[PDB]
Write a protein that binds this DNA or RNA. Structure first.
Ligand code: MG
Ligand code: MG
Ligand code: MG
Ligand code: MG
Ligand code: MG
Ligand code: MG
Ligand code: MG
Ligand code: MG
Ligand code: MG
Ligand code: MG
Ligand code: MG
Ligand code: MG
Ligand code: MG
Ligand code: MG
Ligand code: MG
Ligand code: MG
Ligand code: MG
Ligand code: ZN
Lengths: 116, 152, 127, 99, 83, 60
RNA sequence: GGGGACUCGUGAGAGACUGCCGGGGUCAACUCGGAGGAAGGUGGGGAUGACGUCAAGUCAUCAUGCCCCUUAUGUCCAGGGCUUCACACAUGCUACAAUGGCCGGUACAAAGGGCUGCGAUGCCGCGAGGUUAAGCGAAUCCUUAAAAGCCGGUCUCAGUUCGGAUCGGGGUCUGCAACUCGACCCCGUGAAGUCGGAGUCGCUAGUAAUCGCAGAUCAGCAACGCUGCGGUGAAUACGUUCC
């Protein structure tokens, strides 16, 4: 089955399978399940197309899914790049933007130890 | 130390199993101060062993420790231009401690899910004399016996 | 006149009120199983009562305060031991040799400056 | 009745008890219902300083600030004894507080 | 000041200079020294040579730099690639 | 430190959050204990001289 | 209310000082073991640092002899910086999971802090936080819920219901002002990492190991630093040849 992504890891509680979508994690899945009524503890192989089709409209009603969320993210960072602020310049240089120290860290934003 | 021996601290007998042995295994598997958790793990393993065999868990443990009791160690020494191992006798208490440590260490890195079934399988294998602790004891015994020439 | 002694193990003090009875540990509304799920604690308590004789007799009740589970268990054990000693001076050699009368003074070592704990020291890292 | 209360506090030892039981406790002849000094737990203020003026962090010396409180008696507000109490004064090392 | 209880943070000696010019015109290059002032939606079409420690950086807001800050666009430090 | 900075601290400051606490004996702006108002080293010397009512060496 | 029955609190003593005994020891020192005891040889620990050394550190806690400037090397203000970043080192935290993660219930501390404050309840908000407000210069008020511990379900060894670094969006608190240049809260995204080479660090008892609590600096920045507190809580020492 597929709503936007695969959403169906084999032998997994759909509570955690909903976390596999781009836009829903633990809390979003919990609040969605609370609204819908279907219990969290159930194997994904037992889910049925009717439950899938009532779940499909809910996510697009208010939440968002793969593709457009990343489009908004990339548009945001691209606008930040083109406007030329301190954060935009840091993004252009690949350096972390939220005031983290750069003397001995930022290995995630940069690569591993170059050892020139 | 240099100023004589140090007395070893005593132990209490478990109300569930009135023997110092079970408390010794609980102490050996105890980590991070969770004595209750170690007791739970050892009790689950013992109950599993009793379920699989039928005989008394303390008797199975005694059979296992008698089977995995070693005789000699391979403590090494260096004199001149080379170092060689010296096989010496082992005291009963040290042998029991070494066998218990070996059993716990080999049960810790087994291919099962939880330490209840892990330790149950380990103690059953030691009782039948075919487990990892038995293999380690045989390897130690033979590799020490191979150094019988240097017995000073 | 009820028999009352002082019992401490690490930080807990229990005020025994030993009186004649059948024998059931009243610990302010919580039974032995309700309070202490540990078999070790459940043996440590009632060890002084069953160490010699006899055999599950008159109950005790003591207030609870401070320490933890093992500390409270040890304090209760010492309190029952001292109460038994006060009630009957004949069995004094029994508990006296059993070592249920010693306070067992053992407190946590105070932290010292320059060390990350009481005895644990920071990494040396010469040169 | 039991209205007048004292909150005697001193920073030093052997003077609080003396200046209480030999000055305030002089009202036993005056006719005030005395319950007696009640020894409250001693306060302890803990501060740590570095022994060296520079760079030697591992040289530390600790100090303790103790404060002793007692004499919380409920002596009656009889005019004669209360006038005597307000007329007498204790050394500044101990602080008097009438409640 | 980043709290929905007092509005934004804009300097009074900056308002009394920008609001007296925006009535008729977008003023030319202007001198400012308070990098900490927020950009209210009145700076559109104007320029601000914002100080950064040694000189003034002229910054123009077109449509989007309303939630930003004046000093956000003035490099306070300069790095040029040791290698 | 500097007597000019001492006077600047002692004076009534515009944007009062610019104020700070220094030693009452030497003017050190760091390690000042609000209970006494002295710096750490001056406090230690004063404690050794025994001019603080209630402050003395601790052993426990 | 009543009570000094009990802990407890804080004032004064007894006691543990090889005190007594057995054997040994030049009979002396002392050694080894016993009875009574809270503790046995120093009951445990803290303060306590000899002659001096490193021309050790501090001219930047403070002070001091000689030189150097007095429209300046004095002083103030507004921004920036003390927080950068191809790299290496040192000290701590996090993990790499099933001794475990999550959900619900649940019991036991010490020591501290508090009128520029502790904000009991009540209301709003999932939330941090905001609002009115009582008690509290304090054994009576707040902090105050302790976490480890226990029970029931789920997950089933997987880069995972492990991991929380990075990033986007949205709020709270202090501060005139939080991009530089603070902390916290909500959602989503969810990296390395699967036990770490040669080598190397600490630790003998309530020790190591582990989990929480409090103070000081401070308007905010310290649940990764410092200093103290408490709970659970082990294994080894045959021996001094070897670094
Ligand atoms: Mg500790
Ligand atoms: Mg060093
Ligand atoms: Mg300040
Ligand atoms: Mg001495
Ligand atoms: Mg020198
Ligand atoms: Mg120097
Ligand atoms: Mg000087
Ligand atoms: Mg720095
Ligand atoms: Mg650290
Ligand atoms: Mg998680
Ligand atoms: Mg929970
Ligand atoms: Mg609410
Ligand atoms: Mg794995
Ligand atoms: Mg990987
Ligand atoms: Mg993760
Ligand atoms: Mg290795
Ligand atoms: Mg603070
Ligand atoms: Zn000073």
């Amino acid at each position: 089955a597929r709503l936007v992504g695969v959403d169906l890891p084999r032998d997994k509680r759909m509570e955690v399978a909903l976390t596999y979508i781009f836009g829903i994690g633990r809390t979003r899945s919990n609040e969605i399940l609370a609204a819908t009524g279907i219990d969290r503890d159930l194997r994904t192989r037992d889910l049925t197309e009717e439950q899938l089709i009532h779940l499909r409209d809910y996510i697009e009603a208010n939440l968002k899914v793969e593709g457009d969320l990343r489009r908004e993210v990339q548009a945001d960072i691209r606008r930040k790049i083109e406007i030329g602020c301190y954060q935009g310049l840091r993004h252009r240089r690949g350096m972390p933007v939220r005031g983290q120290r750069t003397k001995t860290n930022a290995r995630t934003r940069k690569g591993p130890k170059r050892t020139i | 130390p240099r100023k004589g021996p140090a007395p070893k601290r005593p132990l209490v007998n478990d109300p569930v199993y009135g023997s110092q042995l079970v408390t010794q295994l609980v102490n050996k598997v105890l980590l991070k101060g969770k004595k209750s958790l170690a007791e739970r793990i050892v009790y689950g393993a013992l109950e599993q062993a009793r379920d699989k065999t039928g005989t008394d868990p303390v008797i199975t443990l005694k059979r296992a420790l008698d089977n995995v009791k070693p005789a000699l160690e391979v403590r090494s020494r260096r004199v001149g231009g080379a170092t060689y191992q010296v096989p010496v006798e082992v005291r009963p208490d040290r042998s029991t401690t070494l066998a218990l440590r070996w059993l716990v260490g080999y049960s810790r890195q087994r291919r099962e899910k939880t330490m209840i079934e892990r330790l149950a399988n380990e103690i059953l294998d030691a009782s039948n004399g075919l487990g990892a602790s038995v293999k380690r004891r045989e390897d130690t015994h033979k590799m020490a016996e191979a150094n019988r020439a240097f017995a000073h | 006149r009820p028999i009352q002694t002082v019992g401490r193990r690490k930080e807990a003090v229990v005020r025994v009120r030993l009186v004649p009875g059948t024998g059931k540990f009243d610990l302010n509304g919580r039974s032995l199983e309700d309070y202490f799920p540990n078999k070790v604690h459940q043996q440590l308590i009632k060890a002084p009562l069953v160490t010699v004789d006899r055999v599950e007799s008159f109950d005790i009740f003591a207030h609870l305060g401070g320490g933890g589970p093992s500390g409270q268990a040890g304090a209760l054990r010492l309190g029952i031991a001292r109460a038994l000693i006060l009630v009957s001076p004949e069995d004094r050699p029994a508990l006296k040799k059993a070592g249920f009368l010693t306070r067992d003074p053992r407190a946590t070592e105070r932290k010292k400056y320059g060390l990350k704990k009481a005895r644990k020291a920071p990494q040396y890292s010469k040169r | 009745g039991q209205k007048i209360r004292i909150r005697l506090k001193a920073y030093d030892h052997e003077a609080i008890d003396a200046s209480a039981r030999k000055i305030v406790e002089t009202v036993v002849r005056t006719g005030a219902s005395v319950v007696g000094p009640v020894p409250l737990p001693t306060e302890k203020n803990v501060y740590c300083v570095i022994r060296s003026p520079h760079k030697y962090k591992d040289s530390r010396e600790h100090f303790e600030m103790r404060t002793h409180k007692r004499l919380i008696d409920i002596i009656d507000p009889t005019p004669k004894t209360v006038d005597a109490l307000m007329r007498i004064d204790l050394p500044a090392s101990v602080d008097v507080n009438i409640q | 000041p980043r709290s929905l209880k007092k509005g934004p943070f804009v300097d009074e000696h900056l308002l009394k200079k920008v609001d007296v010019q925006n009535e008729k015109n977008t003023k030319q290059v202007i001198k400012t020294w308070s990098r900490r002032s927020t950009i209210i939606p009145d700076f559109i079409g104007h320029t601000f040579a914002v100080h950064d420690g040694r000189k003034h950086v002229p910054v123009f807001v077109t449509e989007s730099m309303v939630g930003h800050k004046l000093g956000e666009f003035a490099p306070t430090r300069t790095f040029k690639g040791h290698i | 430190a500097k007597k000019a900075l001492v006077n600047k601290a002692a004076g009534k400051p515009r944007f009062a959050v610019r104020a700070y606490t220094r030693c009452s004996k030497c003017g050190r702006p760091r390690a000042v204990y609000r209970k006494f108002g002295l710096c750490r080293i001056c406090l230690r010397e004063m404690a050794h001289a025994g001019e603080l009512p209630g402050v003395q060496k601790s052993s426990w």
